[PDB]
Amino acid sequence: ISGGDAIYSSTGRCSLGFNVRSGSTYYFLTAGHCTDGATTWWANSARTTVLGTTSGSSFPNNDYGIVRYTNTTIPKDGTVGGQDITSAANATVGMAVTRRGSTTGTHSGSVTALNATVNYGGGDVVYGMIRTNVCAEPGDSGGPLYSGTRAIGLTSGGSGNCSSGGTTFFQPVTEALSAYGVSVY
Numbered sequence: 519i520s521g522g523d524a525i526y527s528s529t530g531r532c533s534l535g536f537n538v539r540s541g542s543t544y545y546f547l548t549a550g551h552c553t554d555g556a557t558t559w560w561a562n563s564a565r566t567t568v569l570g571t572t573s574g575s576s577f578p579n580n581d582y583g584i585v586r587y588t589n590t591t592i593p594k595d596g597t598v599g600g601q602d603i604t605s606a607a608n609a610t611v612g613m614a615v616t617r618r619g620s621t622t623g624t625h626s627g628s629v630t631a632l633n634a635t636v637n638y639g640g641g642d643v644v645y646g647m648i649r650t651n652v653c654a655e656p657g658d659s660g661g662p663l664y665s666g667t668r669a670i671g672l673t674s675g676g677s678g679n680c681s682s683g684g685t686t687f688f689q690p691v692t693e694a695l696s697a698y699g700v701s702v703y
């Protein structure tokens with residue numbers, strides 16, 4: 519399993535963001551709105567291949583969370599599909615970026631603003647977000663935003679779709695890495 523692949527909680531489907539670790543303890547990052555209220559995560563819709571257990575969630579304000587792997591045999595590739603990931607970096611305005619998710623696959627675009635605020639309603643306001651003209655659809659949440667070998671963001675939300683076009687906001691991944699003291703590999 520790698521960044522962008524489907525992940526299933528007790529209630530629905532999101533996307534794996536990045537595989538990360540502290541030492542030989544492996545985890546993955548995803549969206550906080552996906553980890554909120556979740557316990558176990560599975561790799562398949564039939565919920566027979568366990569991945570692991572929710573181990574942190576920050577949503578709203580931020581939108582990141584972390585899952586501790588309990589499945590010792592599944593491959594945990596330090597990649598986003600075929601893209602090798604080696605480090606994390608921060609977005610800049612105008613930067614070419616790529617998202618991968620489990621609903622719509624791989625889509626590219628550009629960063630249009632930094633430090634964006636998104637009000638999802640119901641008190642769920644998030645701050646500090648990377649705004650882009652990349653599209654996304656439900657189920658893509660949590661998936662990676664990257665540029666080359668650099669991990670940049672986690673899919674939070676937005677408007678539109680991949681057929682007609684859209685606007686998507688991403689949580690900076692560096693914040694999540696620092697909050698938990700974990701690293702991409």
Ligand SMILES: N[C@@H](Cc1ccc(O)cc1)C(=O)O
Nearest residue numbers: 654655656657659676677678
């Ligand atoms: N909110 C979706 C992600 C999303 C992104 C952009 C959109 O236009 C719509 C949905 C997730 O929880 O799975």
Ligand SMILES: [Cl-]
Nearest residue numbers: 530531563657
């Ligand atoms: Cl599904």
Ligand SMILES: [Cl-]
Nearest residue numbers: 539540541701
């Ligand atoms: Cl380490």
Ligand SMILES: [Cl-]
Nearest residue numbers: 544590593594
């Ligand atoms: Cl391993």
Ligand SMILES: [Cl-]
Nearest residue numbers: 665666667668
């Ligand atoms: Cl690179």
